[PDB]
Amino acid sequence: LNSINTNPGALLALQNLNSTNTELAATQGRINTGKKVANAKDNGAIWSMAKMQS
């Protein structure tokens, strides 16, 4: 419980901060490009349809 060697709560806090940082990077890329489907990684089907129709 009150062990000094490890604290699970800090690991869970790191995981939550990593998750919000990941979604923040995703919205940052969506903002800097202006497309919800900017590249093939975002969604391959809509991206291929967009490239062919363009």
Next chain:
Amino acid sequence: ALKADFESLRDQLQKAATNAKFNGVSLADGSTTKLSFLANEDGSNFTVTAQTLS
């Protein structure tokens, strides 16, 4: 001369009707009776009856 103009007009009509595709499908050329689109998370469709213009 009026006959030749009427024929050029019917030809341009058929060209404009044939060239109405989007993403490889069209509601105007009469190639298909209808197109359905998602309208529910269960998979219910939103039918759009085709209106042939050829």
